[PDB]
A and B are shown apart, each in its own frame.
Chain A
Amino acid sequence: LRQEAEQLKNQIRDARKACADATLSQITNNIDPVGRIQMRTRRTLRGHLAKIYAMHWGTDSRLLVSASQDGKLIIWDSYTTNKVHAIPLRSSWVMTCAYAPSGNYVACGGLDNICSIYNLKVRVSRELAGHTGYLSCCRFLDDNQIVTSSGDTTCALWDIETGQQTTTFTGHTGDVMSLSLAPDTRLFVSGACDASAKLWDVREGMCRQTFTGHESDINAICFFPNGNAFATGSDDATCRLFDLRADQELMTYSHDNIICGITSVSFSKSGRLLLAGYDDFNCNVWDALKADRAGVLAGHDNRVSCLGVTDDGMAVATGSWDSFLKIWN
């Protein structure tokens, strides 16, 4: 069976090579480059006693949520810096958090293999407990459905009102670290500790395509605004842009001065800029088309753990291990 697998792998590689006639860099040679982008810190949010592990912007572009090591899930009002909510967790090993699109529910989870869902109307409303490994990322499809990825090499689609695993996605050979939902909310992607990202159909429940060009574990993933591409960041100090229709890697964002992996990846509203949070205590803003570093965001005393971009693209929120969350404009 191994020989057949190698045969289809060679056929896939040959088809991909034949399909690729030009390169993105060659096409993006006659366009004007983005000028030196210098984004300044407008707000800083304090109150977390320990390192911040994840964050998620609200769909109203104003409120956000952040989870820290001290077992605290704090919901901030970004505009006035005033704190809105503070939820204590049963376990202080939270690795991810999420904000419901309607703004009524907030989910988190971690080393306890439990996806806790709190109702903001703050009492815990549901505990989804079906995973075998740590839960690494959870995203909200609706107030009744959620998609999670665990460290047991599986993803899941849960129905919240019942508490059961409606669908399970298998195929990863390593711990799944991050996932991103397409804007159509019908397809999504998952990056694992396997140097391979995969595309899952939510309704069908079967993997459509697998993109493997990386060299080490993938720590973060984000989806292009138009829904036909996505960028992944890994531990080999590189970011990569993959295209859905061509099913091949398009551009590689890296410089010969970085020896640290990427812990967070996000796009701008128009997709022209790609923001990558690094373990070197700073973030980099790349030109997503010219593959040239257009700017650097510095000011964190520890590694940037989470990075997000506002829905309307008016701000970028970065949370690092320095127990501080900074908003850049």
Chain B
Amino acid sequence: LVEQLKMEANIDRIKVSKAAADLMAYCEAHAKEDPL
């Protein structure tokens, strides 16, 4: 259990602003074709 936490704590994390921008860009790009 401790080894799993140690492994999960040793990753690189991307700032929330970049993730939100990517989600917004994907939604804007693909909104034109969505039938709903």
Query: A: which residues have CB within 8 A of B?
Result: 1, 4-5, 8-9, 11-12, 15-16, 19-24, 27-28, 31, 37, 39, 171, 206-210, 224-226, 228-229, 243, 245-248, 250, 268-273, 288-289, 312-314, 316, 329
A245 touches B26 (CB 8 A): no
Q: Cβ of B21: which chain A residues have Cβ within 8 Å of it?
A: 27
Partner of B23, one of A207, A229, A269: A229
B8 touches A27 (CB 8 A): no
A21 touches B16 (CB 8 A): yes
Dominant SS among interface residues on chain B: helix
Q: Cβ of B4: which chain A residues have Cβ within 8 Å of it?
A: 171, 207
A31 and B25 alpha carbons, distance in the complex (Å): 12
A21 and B19 alpha carbons, distance in the complex (Å): 11
A196 and B19 alpha carbons, distance in the complex (Å): 21
Number of CB contacts from chain A to chain B under 8 A: 120
A246 touches B16 (CB 8 A): yes
A209 touches B20 (CB 8 A): no
Q: How far is the CB of A206 from chain B (nearest CB, A)?
A: 8
Q: What residue in chain A is nearest B36 (Cβ atoms)?
A: A268
Partner of B13, one of A15, A273, A288: A15
A273 and B21 alpha carbons, distance in the complex (Å): 17
A28 and B8 alpha carbons, distance in the complex (Å): 30
Per-position contact with A for B1-36: 1 when CB-CB < 8 Å, else 0?
Answer: 110111111010111111111111011001101111
A210 and B34 alpha carbons, distance in the complex (Å): 31
A113 and B26 alpha carbons, distance in the complex (Å): 40
Q: Given known contacts A21-B16, A245-B19, A246-B15, is B9 in contact with A15 (CB within 8 Å)? A: yes
Q: Cβ of B20: which chain A residues have Cβ within 8 Å of it?
A: 22-24, 27-28, 250
Partner of B24, one of A16, A27, A273: A27
B17 touches A22 (CB 8 A): yes
A209 touches B17 (CB 8 A): no
B16 touches A210 (CB 8 A): no
B14 touches A245 (CB 8 A): yes
